[PDB]
Amino acid sequence: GHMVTRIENLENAKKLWDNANSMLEKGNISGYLKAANELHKFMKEKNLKEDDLRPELSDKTISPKGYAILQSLWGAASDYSRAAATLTESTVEPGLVSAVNKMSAFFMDCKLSPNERATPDPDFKVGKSKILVGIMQFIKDVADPTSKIWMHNTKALMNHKIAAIQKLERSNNVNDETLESVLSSKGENLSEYLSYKYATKDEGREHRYTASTENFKNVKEKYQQMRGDALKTEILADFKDKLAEATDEQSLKQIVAELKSKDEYRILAKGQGLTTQLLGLKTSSVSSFEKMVEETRESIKSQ
């Protein structure tokens, strides 16, 4: 087991920084943040500081275009941080977005002394929505699997917001008001969040065959005392969370195959009324699950 020189670690930090700058230059926001994050992780592990790396970057430059993107990123992040501070919740999401700012600042501080001014190209424009999606993608990548914003898993909420912003992009309805609604949302409306009209934590609808965990040997213990629409709501929520761990197309297909093999999925797929079972259509909850797979696919088919 084994040692590395300071020279050698600085040379690798220089490469990590270059990779970040290169992503910055191409306008790949999530790629830049991720690359910044790797630089920080590597430097922390080798006990290297920004001022150790700075002299070594003397032959490298953040372009004017680069500083313009970083200024837009800074602005979008500050604004998002404020917008995410809400009556429902104001600690986690703002903390996460302001930390994205601190990560970018770290990339800048490797190159610039404490008071040096950024020199952004004033003509270079970058769409607010591409920035926000990038921020959200980075937060989704880096937040702990157990992180929660209000009552919802953080990775899942990010994918939800990224899909909402992408829908605004596709239908040409992106403006400050529609972005604000997304940035300030915590998924308070459960039925929209899960894409399931009958989402509830209460008794929901009357059913001749109210969904039940009895007759499913393998169902997790947490569901055993839930029934009906509420049972399905809880299964869908946990499925949404598991789907949010997907990182690429192969990963998503694998997770989907796992979830569809579970007794919880058969509960979703089992109709709760006799007329409905005789029709031979997908249940509403299975439909919701399929929409979540599509949402997750869109939040991940991008970079």
Mark whether 188 and 95 lie in a shared domain.
yes
Mark whether 167 and 243 lie in a shared domain.
no
Burial of 248 from C-beta contacts in 10 A (0-12 / 13-18 / 19+) = exposed
Mark whether 43 and 179 lie in a shared domain.
yes
Last residue of a domain, one of 193, 221, 240: 193
- Give the β-pairing of 152-153 and 148-149: antiparallel
Two tokens, residue 206: 């009357």
Resolution of this entry, Å? 2.5
Displacement of CA 296 from its chain's centroid (Å): 10
Mark whether 198 and 276 lie in a shared domain.
yes
Mark whether 188 and 49 lie in a shared domain.
yes
Mark whether 101 and 228 lie in a shared domain.
no
- In whole angstroms, what is the distance from residue 203 CA to residue 189 CA? 17
Helix (H) or strand (E) holding 34: helix 29-45
How many CB atoms lie under 10 A from the CB of residue 18? 14
Mark whether 11 and 148 lie in a shared domain.
yes
Report the first-to-last Cα separation within the chain, whole angstroms. Answer: 37
Domain count, the chain: 2
Residues 163-189 as b or e (16 or more Cβ within 10 Å = b): bbbbebeeeeebeeebbeebbbbbbee
Dihedral (CA of 39, 40, 45, 49) sign: positive
No. of helices (H) and no. of strands (E), the chain: 14, 2
Mark whether 234 and 102 lie in a shared domain.
no
The CATH code of the domain that includes 164 is: 1.20.1260.70
Mark whether 173 and 25 lie in a shared domain.
yes
Last residue of a domain, one of 175, 193, 211: 193
Residue 215's domain spans which residues? 194-303
How many CB atoms lie under 10 A from the CB of residue 91? 11
Helix (H) or strand (E) holding 120: none
Per the CB < 8 A criterion, the answer to whether 227 and 210 are in contact is yes
Burial of 270 from C-beta contacts in 10 A (0-12 / 13-18 / 19+) = middle
Chain breaks in the chain (C to N over 2.5 A) after: none
SS3 state of residue 153: strand
Last residue of a domain, one of 167, 193, 219: 193
Mark whether 76 and 153 lie in a shared domain.
yes
Dihedral (CA of 19, 41, 159, 124) sign: negative
Mark whether 162 and 180 lie in a shared domain.
yes
Mark whether 174 and 265 lie in a shared domain.
no
Two tokens, residue 167: 């829908």
